[PDB]
Design a protein around this nucleic acid. Structure first.
Ligand SMILES: [Mg+2]
Ligand SMILES: [Mg+2]
Ligand SMILES: [Mg+2]
Ligand SMILES: [Mg+2]
Ligand SMILES: [Mg+2]
Ligand SMILES: [Mg+2]
Ligand SMILES: [Mg+2]
Ligand SMILES: [Mg+2]
Ligand SMILES: [Mg+2]
Ligand SMILES: [Mg+2]
Ligand SMILES: [Mg+2]
Ligand SMILES: [Mg+2]
Ligand SMILES: [Mg+2]
Ligand SMILES: [Mg+2]
Ligand SMILES: [Mg+2]
Ligand SMILES: [Mg+2]
Ligand SMILES: [Mg+2]
Ligand SMILES: [Mg+2]
Ligand SMILES: [Mg+2]
Ligand SMILES: [Mg+2]
Ligand SMILES: [Mg+2]
Ligand SMILES: [Mg+2]
Ligand SMILES: [Mg+2]
Ligand SMILES: [Mg+2]
Ligand SMILES: [Mg+2]
Ligand SMILES: [Mg+2]
Ligand SMILES: [Mg+2]
Ligand SMILES: [Mg+2]
Ligand SMILES: [Mg+2]
Ligand SMILES: [Mg+2]
Ligand SMILES: [Mg+2]
Ligand SMILES: [Mg+2]
Ligand SMILES: [Mg+2]
Ligand SMILES: [Mg+2]
Ligand SMILES: [Mg+2]
Ligand SMILES: [Mg+2]
Ligand SMILES: [Mg+2]
Ligand SMILES: [Mg+2]
Ligand SMILES: [Mg+2]
Lengths: 100, 63, 76, 44
RNA sequence: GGGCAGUUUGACUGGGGCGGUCGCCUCCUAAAAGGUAACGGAGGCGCCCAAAGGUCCCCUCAGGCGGGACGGAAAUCCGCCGGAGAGCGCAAGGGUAGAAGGGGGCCUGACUGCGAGGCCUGCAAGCCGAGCAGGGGCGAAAGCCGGGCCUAGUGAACCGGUGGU
RNA sequence: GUAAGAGGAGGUAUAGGGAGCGACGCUUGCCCGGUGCCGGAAGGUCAAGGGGAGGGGUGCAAGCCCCGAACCGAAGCCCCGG
RNA sequence: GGCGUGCCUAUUGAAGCAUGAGCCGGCGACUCACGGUCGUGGGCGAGCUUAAGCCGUUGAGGCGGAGGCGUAGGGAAACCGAG
RNA sequence: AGCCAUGGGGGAAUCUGGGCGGACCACCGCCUAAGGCUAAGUACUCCGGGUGACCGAUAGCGCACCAGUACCGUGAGGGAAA
RNA sequence: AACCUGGGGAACUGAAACAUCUCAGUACCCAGAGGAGAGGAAAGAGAAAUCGACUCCCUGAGUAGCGGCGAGCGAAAGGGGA
């Protein structure tokens, strides 16, 4: 704060959507999970297992991707990176999310 | 109790993943009238700061 | 009275000196007009700013009638 | 006088400065929009 | 609508007040880099220009002496002398005819998307800029053009207006 | 005093409120432009509201919702005068 | 006989003819809560940790993963993602 | 700028009814206003009890002692020492 | 004594001035209630073709938002408990 002068608050807000009366809109929340940790344990990975112990934390959605060597197994996920779908396609199935 | 995030600062400044603070270039909304294409472009990109970076950190802390 | 006035210092003159290594683009010397001319691998801007175009060392070359030139001898 | 040039058959502006009484009523100078490249720009 | 209420009524300042000033540019002070105060000396700006701009080619001043119909100290034409003492829109300085100065032709780079690396700097801000891409002007071309020889001609943020995405 | 009510006054313009001069003697000049106040059914300006030309949103449409010109609109101010 | 300008505060400067104290004795002033930031000792480690609360105790501990920090960033956002 | 409440004006309908889901429309969906009652979980501590890395007569309640007393104020009120 | 609901309701102070804001619906005044009070069986919440009165504790969260977008102010749904 203080100085007596116009504080360094001279900067400005480009951030749009900074606010709205009714508040927040209810939209999905995709969790970025790297397949490197996904490769750690092996069996049949699903949102159930990740939230049960991993890096999901009750997040609304799941989405594997990133660096790492994809182990062989079915990977049920809400979304896939174009590069992510490659590693698993090299040795595994591609179980998409729900729909209803 | 419980530091209150300075909303006036958050709405205008985002912190980098590392530890740096970034904000838009100043002077680009009003003074304008017919400045060199360089200026208006130079003002388009955001930037890093120096000491007061630490200052503005001590606000969006809970954030 | 009515006199206390003066535009702040522009801090011009010779910035870079001979025998100095330099990157590419370094404003070698700022000037008021043409107190110094460009030269080998040395460009200038509107305000008559002298700046390197290459990487090397600064060098000065007086030539009386022509004037005082400044250039950077490339090397690596 | 503050001037602003528009684009033909499109919707784009540009910084300018015309003259009031001084010999200068219209502005038919060419310019470069974002869509495609180079098209005449009127005052308007 | 002072009947009543709540408040504001600046700073510098050889004590206050009165007076003057408050931002930006030029020079001096400033002690041969930079910078450097004083109610220290001395002046300007809050603009202007589609041509007073980009480019290609052409062209060279002021003043002095002599000659010349009106003019005549000085309009215009001729000759010789004449390195910058002119001009460079407007203050001053540095610069400049080996052009940045005067003229004609074509013409709109008074572009969008960027920006290596720097000067200056507490912050913010200011200032320079090669080279790259798209595309376009002048030129045979090498090449120049990201506004005026240059350093003043300006205002963070907020709040709102108009057109699009 | 929020009100009820009270004073004024159980008075009635030879009375009561406000203001300025301050026994009484001789007097109290000129100036309405500015200010206040008093008079002024025209005109100008004006709010809510009325009015709805015309325009928008959405829906299959019937409709629902919204924006909105001319024009009728008071005191006040302007204007005229004392 | 030699040498020698009280204490405190405030100051560019005090023995000061600047402030405070008559003398003694006692009360008298950087704390806590929560949140944050750096350091530090220690446990565990892509994991770490629980809050109300329930059980027990009568100066005992235990259970309780709701939740929070971390493992991915970037953009105003749609979105995309080692970019 | 919806929703809950409502001072002013206008002012319906009874399940083909009516509100709401953040101005409005449409679709999809939640709910039944304009009558009242309802324990427990919760707050507090004049009063009693238990306990304390709480005090130990300038501390601790103002008051360990016949203290809201003496004494001071017109009065609210102030308020010891021991 | 304090706690509780309803009807009224400040200013200092903060914003390094101040007037919107803040202090705060706090202090105080008033009426009422009882060991409690209040609230309470949806014309609810809000996006799950989900939950299912009310009250209180965690959490949600310093999030959503509010704001001379200043100082500052500050929910709800949902999940876990009584
Ligand atoms: Mg841009
Ligand atoms: Mg958080
Ligand atoms: Mg100088
Ligand atoms: Mg100097
Ligand atoms: Mg010097
Ligand atoms: Mg020019
Ligand atoms: Mg000259
Ligand atoms: Mg030329
Ligand atoms: Mg020129
Ligand atoms: Mg800087
Ligand atoms: Mg400047
Ligand atoms: Mg190219
Ligand atoms: Mg503001
Ligand atoms: Mg009255
Ligand atoms: Mg009467
Ligand atoms: Mg009577
Ligand atoms: Mg007489
Ligand atoms: Mg109307
Ligand atoms: Mg009238
Ligand atoms: Mg003292
Ligand atoms: Mg003194
Ligand atoms: Mg000292
Ligand atoms: Mg003394
Ligand atoms: Mg003193
Ligand atoms: Mg004394
Ligand atoms: Mg702490
Ligand atoms: Mg409202
Ligand atoms: Mg009503
Ligand atoms: Mg009922
Ligand atoms: Mg009850
Ligand atoms: Mg003891
Ligand atoms: Mg007495
Ligand atoms: Mg005040
Ligand atoms: Mg004040
Ligand atoms: Mg409030
Ligand atoms: Mg009850
Ligand atoms: Mg409890
Ligand atoms: Mg809470
Ligand atoms: Mg608070």
């Amino acid at each position: 704060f203080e100085g007596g002068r116009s504080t360094t608050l001279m900067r400005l807000p480009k951030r749009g959507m900074q606010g709205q009366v009714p508040g927040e809109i209810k939209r999905p929340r995709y969790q970025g999970v790297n397949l490197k940790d996904l490769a750690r344990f092996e069996g049949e990975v699903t949102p159930e297992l990740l939230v049960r112990a991993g890096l999901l934390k009750k997040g609304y959605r799941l989405k594997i991707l990133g660096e790492g060597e994809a182990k062989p197994l079915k990977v049920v996920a809400h979304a896939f990176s174009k590069s992510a779908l490659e590693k698993l396609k090299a040795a595994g199935g591609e179980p998409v999310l729900l729909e209803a | 109790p419980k530091m209150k995030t300075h909303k006036g600062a958050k709405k205008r400044v985002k912190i980098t993943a590392s530890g740096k603070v970034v904000a838009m270039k100043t002077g680009k909304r009003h003074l304008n009238w017919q400045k060199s294409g360089k200026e208006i472009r130079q003002k388009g990109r955001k930037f890093v700061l120096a000491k007061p970076e630490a200052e503005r950190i001590k606000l969006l802390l809970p954030y | 009275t009515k006199n206390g006035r003066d535009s702040q210092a522009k801090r011009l003159g010779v910035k870079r000196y001979e025998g100095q290594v330099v990157r590419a683009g370094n404003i070698l010397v700022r000037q008021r007009g043409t107190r110094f001319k460009p030269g080998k691998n040395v460009g200038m801007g509107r305000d008559f700013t002298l700046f390197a175009l290459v990487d090397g060392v600064v060098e000065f070359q007086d030539r009386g009638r022509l004037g005082r030139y400044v250039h950077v001898r490339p090397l690596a | 006088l503050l001037l602003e040039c528009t684009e033909c058959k499109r919707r784009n502006y540009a910084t300018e400065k015309n003259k009031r009484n001084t010999p200068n009523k219209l502005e038919l100078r060419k310019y470069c929009p974002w869509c495609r490249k180079h098209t005449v720009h009127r005052e308007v």
